[PDB]
Amino acid sequence: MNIFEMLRIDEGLRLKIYKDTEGYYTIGIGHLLTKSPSLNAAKSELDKAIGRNTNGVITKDEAEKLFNQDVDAAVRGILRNAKLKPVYDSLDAVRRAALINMVFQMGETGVAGFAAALAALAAKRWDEAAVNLAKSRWYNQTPNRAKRVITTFRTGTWDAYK
Ligand SMILES: [Cl-]
Ligand SMILES: [Cl-]
């Protein structure tokens, strides 16, 4: 298992514009296009991102390229955030993947906000981090995905994904 496989499972793959759990236009493997409620706006963003006139449909290769870029960016955002970086550096490989998953999903500003869970994670108090993590809108809104990530932090293994 790895970060790409992990996200592909949490996000799925859709080759045609769709609305994510929040009602926003997305495409591919969770690539958010826009928060605007307008499909044209979404399409326009999609075109700009792909580099061609898409008509709201992309290919698999295209979806995968957006994904790599997105994973790369989530990694780079973590490394550049004063709050996330030292946590990530302190973690083992599996757990770093769990962190990248969260950032991919919520953006780094959103994750940097879990002051308490981040401190617990850095101190290696897995169960305390897990309980805190669960007290969040994130967990209440997308509970199955949240539980998968929280378990990964708690255990340090890929069990929730096998
Ligand atoms: Cl883009
Ligand atoms: Cl969910």
Curated annotation (Swiss-Prot):
<feature type="binding site">
    <location>
        <position position="32"/>
    </location>
    <ligand>
        <name>substrate</name>
    </ligand>
</feature>
<keyword id="KW-0204">Cytolysis</keyword>
<keyword id="KW-1188">Viral release from host cell</keyword>
<dbReference type="GO" id="GO:0009253">
    <property type="term" value="P:peptidoglycan catabolic process"/>
</dbReference>
<feature type="binding site">
    <location>
        <position position="104"/>
    </location>
    <ligand>
        <name>substrate</name>
    </ligand>
</feature>
<feature type="active site" description="Proton donor/acceptor">
    <location>
        <position position="20"/>
    </location>
</feature>
<feature type="active site" description="Proton donor/acceptor">
    <location>
        <position position="11"/>
    </location>
</feature>
<feature type="binding site">
    <location>
        <position position="132"/>
    </location>
    <ligand>
        <name>substrate</name>
    </ligand>
</feature>
<keyword id="KW-0929">Antimicrobial</keyword>
<dbReference type="InterPro" id="IPR001165">
    <property type="entry name" value="T4-type_lysozyme"/>
</dbReference>
<dbReference type="InterPro" id="IPR052619">
    <property type="entry name" value="Phage_lysozyme-like"/>
</dbReference>
<protein>
    <recommendedName>
        <fullName>Endolysin</fullName>
        <ecNumber>3.2.1.17</ecNumber>
    </recommendedName>
</protein>
<dbReference type="InterPro" id="IPR002196">
    <property type="entry name" value="Glyco_hydro_24"/>
</dbReference>
<comment type="similarity">
    <text>Belongs to the glycosyl hydrolase 24 family.</text>
</comment>
<dbReference type="Pfam" id="PF00959">
    <property type="entry name" value="Phage_lysozyme"/>
</dbReference>
<dbReference type="InterPro" id="IPR023346">
    <property type="entry name" value="Lysozyme-like_dom_sf"/>
</dbReference>
<keyword id="KW-0081">Bacteriolytic enzyme</keyword>
<comment type="function">
    <text>Endolysin with lysozyme activity that degrades host peptidoglycans and participates with the holin and spanin proteins in the sequential events which lead to the programmed host cell lysis releasing the mature viral particles. Once the holin has permeabilized the host cell membrane, the endolysin can reach the periplasm and break down the peptidoglycan layer.</text>
</comment>
<dbReference type="GO" id="GO:0003796">
    <property type="term" value="F:lysozyme activity"/>
</dbReference>
<dbReference type="GO" id="GO:0016998">
    <property type="term" value="P:cell wall macromolecule catabolic process"/>
</dbReference>
<dbReference type="GO" id="GO:0044659">
    <property type="term" value="P:viral release from host cell by cytolysis"/>
</dbReference>
<dbReference type="InterPro" id="IPR023347">
    <property type="entry name" value="Lysozyme_dom_sf"/>
</dbReference>
<keyword id="KW-1035">Host cytoplasm</keyword>
<dbReference type="InterPro" id="IPR034690">
    <property type="entry name" value="Endolysin_T4_type"/>
</dbReference>
<keyword id="KW-0578">Host cell lysis by virus</keyword>
<dbReference type="GO" id="GO:0042742">
    <property type="term" value="P:defense response to bacterium"/>
</dbReference>
<keyword id="KW-0326">Glycosidase</keyword>
<dbReference type="GO" id="GO:0030430">
    <property type="term" value="C:host cell cytoplasm"/>
</dbReference>
<keyword id="KW-0378">Hydrolase</keyword>
